[PDB]
Tab-separated table of C-alpha atoms in Angstrom:
chain	number	residue	atom	x	y	z
A	13	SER	CA	52.905	-26.871	219.227
A	14	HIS	CA	51.255	-29.202	221.575
A	15	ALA	CA	50.713	-31.108	218.180
A	16	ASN	CA	54.401	-31.917	218.106
A	17	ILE	CA	54.282	-33.506	221.719
A	18	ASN	CA	51.904	-36.041	220.271
A	19	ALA	CA	54.477	-36.745	217.326
A	20	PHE	CA	56.901	-37.754	220.314
A	21	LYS	CA	54.466	-40.224	222.180
A	22	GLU	CA	53.611	-41.855	218.841
A	23	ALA	CA	56.832	-42.073	217.035
A	24	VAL	CA	58.390	-43.305	220.402
A	25	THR	CA	56.450	-46.789	220.525
A	26	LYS	CA	57.465	-47.352	216.844
A	27	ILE	CA	60.913	-47.922	218.092
A	28	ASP	CA	61.616	-51.240	219.296
A	29	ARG	CA	62.665	-52.206	222.886
A	30	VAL	CA	66.561	-53.121	221.835
A	31	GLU	CA	67.044	-49.803	219.874
A	32	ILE	CA	65.604	-47.660	222.655
A	33	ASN	CA	67.601	-49.615	225.493
A	34	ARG	CA	70.926	-48.849	223.261
A	35	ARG	CA	70.353	-44.994	223.087
A	36	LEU	CA	69.247	-45.230	227.007
A	37	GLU	CA	72.875	-46.664	227.598
A	38	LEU	CA	74.480	-43.889	225.639
A	39	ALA	CA	72.642	-41.295	227.832
A	40	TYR	CA	73.717	-42.845	230.817
A	41	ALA	CA	77.179	-42.962	230.060
A	42	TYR	CA	77.334	-39.385	229.325
A	43	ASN	CA	75.861	-38.780	232.614
A	44	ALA	CA	78.359	-41.104	234.261
A	45	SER	CA	81.027	-38.892	232.444
A	46	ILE	CA	79.546	-35.597	234.034
A	47	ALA	CA	79.295	-37.225	237.485
A	48	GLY	CA	82.958	-37.916	237.818
A	49	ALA	CA	83.813	-34.531	236.368
A	50	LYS	CA	85.975	-32.028	238.078
A	55	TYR	CA	84.102	-28.440	236.628
A	56	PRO	CA	82.465	-27.993	233.062
A	57	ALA	CA	81.537	-24.332	233.436
A	58	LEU	CA	78.010	-23.625	232.442
A	59	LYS	CA	77.286	-20.916	229.790
A	60	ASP	CA	74.369	-19.184	231.452
A	61	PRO	CA	71.488	-19.689	228.433
A	62	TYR	CA	70.889	-15.932	228.434
A	71	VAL	CA	73.474	-27.599	215.111
A	72	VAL	CA	73.724	-29.345	218.572
A	73	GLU	CA	74.282	-33.066	218.632
A	74	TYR	CA	75.447	-33.700	222.000
A	75	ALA	CA	71.918	-35.427	223.060
A	76	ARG	CA	71.314	-37.377	219.580
A	77	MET	CA	70.443	-40.635	221.313
A	78	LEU	CA	67.460	-39.047	223.166
A	79	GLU	CA	66.511	-36.907	219.955
A	80	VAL	CA	63.069	-38.219	218.460
A	81	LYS	CA	61.296	-36.038	216.100
A	82	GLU	CA	63.921	-33.399	217.005
A	83	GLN	CA	62.773	-33.444	220.685
A	84	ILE	CA	64.255	-35.104	223.681
A	85	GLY	CA	61.229	-35.516	225.786
A	86	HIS	CA	58.478	-33.357	227.230
A	87	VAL	CA	57.770	-31.999	230.684
A	88	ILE	CA	54.634	-31.883	232.618
A	89	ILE	CA	53.817	-29.313	235.067
A	90	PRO	CA	50.409	-29.612	236.435
A	91	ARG	CA	50.190	-26.685	238.844
A	92	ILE	CA	50.785	-24.382	235.742
A	93	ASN	CA	48.870	-26.721	233.686
A	94	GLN	CA	51.906	-27.153	231.063
A	95	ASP	CA	53.164	-29.944	228.958
A	96	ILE	CA	55.971	-28.390	226.993
A	97	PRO	CA	58.455	-30.430	224.747
A	98	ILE	CA	62.286	-30.034	225.599
A	99	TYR	CA	65.057	-29.785	222.911
A	100	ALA	CA	68.809	-29.943	223.199
A	101	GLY	CA	70.864	-26.710	223.649
A	102	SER	CA	69.935	-23.034	224.660
A	103	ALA	CA	69.367	-22.272	221.006
A	104	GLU	CA	67.492	-19.098	220.161
A	105	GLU	CA	64.747	-20.289	217.934
A	106	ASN	CA	64.167	-23.378	219.871
A	107	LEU	CA	63.397	-21.413	222.921
A	108	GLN	CA	60.381	-20.119	221.142
A	109	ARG	CA	58.910	-23.677	220.565
A	110	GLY	CA	59.504	-24.998	224.024
A	111	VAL	CA	62.120	-25.684	226.882
A	112	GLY	CA	65.890	-25.815	226.175
A	113	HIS	CA	68.219	-28.077	227.939
A	114	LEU	CA	71.710	-26.351	229.567
A	115	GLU	CA	74.639	-28.062	227.703
A	116	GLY	CA	77.009	-29.081	230.446
A	117	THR	CA	74.262	-30.581	232.949
A	118	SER	CA	72.876	-33.913	233.083
A	119	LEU	CA	70.722	-35.421	230.460
A	120	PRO	CA	67.217	-35.616	231.924
A	121	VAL	CA	66.742	-39.357	232.119
A	122	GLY	CA	67.514	-39.703	236.287
A	123	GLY	CA	69.590	-41.504	237.759
A	124	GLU	CA	71.726	-41.659	240.943
A	125	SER	CA	74.168	-38.496	240.785
A	126	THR	CA	72.152	-36.281	238.251
A	127	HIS	CA	71.089	-32.780	238.084
A	128	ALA	CA	69.334	-31.776	234.656
A	129	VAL	CA	68.847	-28.176	233.898
A	130	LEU	CA	65.846	-27.206	231.870
A	131	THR	CA	64.806	-23.477	231.068
A	132	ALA	CA	62.069	-21.590	229.383
A	133	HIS	CA	61.145	-17.682	228.319
A	134	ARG	CA	58.317	-16.147	230.120
A	135	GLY	CA	55.630	-13.901	228.693
A	136	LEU	CA	55.418	-14.573	225.357
A	137	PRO	CA	51.969	-13.946	224.200
A	138	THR	CA	51.380	-16.823	222.192
A	139	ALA	CA	53.353	-19.541	224.081
A	140	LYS	CA	53.224	-18.926	227.721
A	141	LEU	CA	55.898	-21.336	228.782
A	142	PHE	CA	57.491	-20.945	232.202
A	143	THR	CA	55.661	-17.867	232.665
A	144	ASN	CA	53.682	-18.926	235.608
A	145	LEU	CA	56.683	-20.747	237.215
A	146	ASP	CA	56.362	-18.583	240.312
A	147	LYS	CA	53.211	-20.296	241.026
A	148	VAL	CA	55.032	-23.541	241.657
A	149	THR	CA	55.754	-24.368	245.241
A	150	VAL	CA	57.913	-26.776	247.166
A	151	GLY	CA	55.685	-29.975	247.312
A	152	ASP	CA	54.434	-29.782	243.924
A	153	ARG	CA	55.323	-32.306	241.231
A	154	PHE	CA	56.642	-32.427	237.663
A	155	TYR	CA	57.193	-35.286	235.190
A	156	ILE	CA	59.665	-36.085	232.429
A	157	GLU	CA	58.708	-38.189	229.535
A	158	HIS	CA	61.564	-39.519	227.373
A	159	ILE	CA	62.361	-42.129	225.101
A	160	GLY	CA	62.245	-44.940	227.895
A	161	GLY	CA	59.398	-43.676	229.962
A	162	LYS	CA	58.072	-41.189	232.536
A	163	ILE	CA	59.939	-40.036	235.511
A	164	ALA	CA	58.758	-37.721	238.229
A	165	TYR	CA	60.016	-35.135	240.496
A	166	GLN	CA	58.889	-33.203	243.704
A	167	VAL	CA	59.973	-29.785	244.360
A	168	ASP	CA	62.032	-29.776	247.398
A	169	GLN	CA	63.909	-26.400	246.865
A	170	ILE	CA	63.363	-22.839	245.373
A	171	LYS	CA	65.987	-20.239	245.067
A	172	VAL	CA	67.028	-17.066	243.389
A	173	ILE	CA	70.429	-16.527	242.166
A	174	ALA	CA	72.463	-13.380	240.639
A	175	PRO	CA	73.131	-14.695	236.883
A	176	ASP	CA	77.163	-14.503	237.983
A	177	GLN	CA	76.433	-17.744	240.271
A	178	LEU	CA	76.187	-21.221	239.139
A	179	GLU	CA	77.140	-23.503	242.058
A	180	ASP	CA	73.607	-24.677	242.459
A	181	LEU	CA	73.514	-25.825	238.973
A	182	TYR	CA	76.114	-28.517	239.413
A	183	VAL	CA	75.650	-32.340	240.013
A	184	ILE	CA	75.018	-33.225	243.775
A	185	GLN	CA	76.729	-36.812	244.253
A	186	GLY	CA	74.349	-39.582	245.322
A	187	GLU	CA	71.132	-37.384	244.550
A	188	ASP	CA	69.026	-37.238	241.775
A	189	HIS	CA	67.555	-33.865	240.861
A	190	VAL	CA	65.986	-31.440	238.140
A	191	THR	CA	66.279	-27.833	238.124
A	192	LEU	CA	63.519	-25.791	236.117
A	193	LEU	CA	65.585	-22.447	235.583
A	194	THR	CA	63.920	-18.972	234.332
A	195	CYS	CA	64.462	-15.530	234.732
A	196	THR	CA	63.190	-12.975	237.669
A	197	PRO	CA	61.746	-10.787	238.888
A	198	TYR	CA	58.709	-10.803	236.226
A	199	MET	CA	59.543	-8.259	233.427
A	200	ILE	CA	62.907	-7.381	235.432
A	201	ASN	CA	65.072	-10.147	234.975
A	202	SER	CA	67.966	-8.999	236.801
A	203	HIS	CA	68.258	-12.662	238.764
A	204	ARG	CA	67.330	-16.136	237.995
A	205	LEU	CA	64.598	-18.262	239.589
A	206	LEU	CA	65.412	-21.937	240.536
A	207	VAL	CA	62.833	-24.515	241.067
A	208	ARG	CA	64.271	-27.657	242.084
A	209	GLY	CA	62.602	-31.253	241.825
A	210	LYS	CA	64.091	-34.308	243.587
A	211	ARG	CA	63.165	-37.784	242.195
A	212	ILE	CA	60.537	-39.748	243.545
A	213	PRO	CA	59.272	-43.073	242.237
A	214	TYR	CA	56.510	-42.695	239.750
A	215	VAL	CA	52.882	-43.803	240.508
A	216	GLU	CA	50.207	-41.501	238.548
A	217	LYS	CA	48.955	-44.015	236.143
């Protein structure tokens, strides 16, 4: 739950520097591929192996949003039962390891009584930060843009060359769900410790 986020942190440091690196390289190449593409077409999210190099205890990292006090693991795919445990990554977009010309897209449900999750995302504001902890470390984002789009539209979801973004996508307005809320971070250097 919050308990399988620790399964992550701990299991990671049992993987040695070399192995970690090899996996990271695979993710980078995957991202380079997407960078250079010409367009995947992204099935709006409303097994999956594409991100195995990143998977540790069936998760690909976790995401921390301080403003809403969440720390939620991230699972590959927008799969139906995975969105009950945490955050799903939209296949077709960059893998959430950052780097020049990336754009990862993460997504989560709102208003599940037990989970919570992205329900409180509307409370997030340009200027807040959020952080992504994956096999090779923590990376940090600062919300530069906030947008509301019809589900048909996706142009905002694609890689912007030269730039490094992560989008936290959810449905909106609350309990109406006719459009999508996009909360966009822009990479900043990590300095929290």
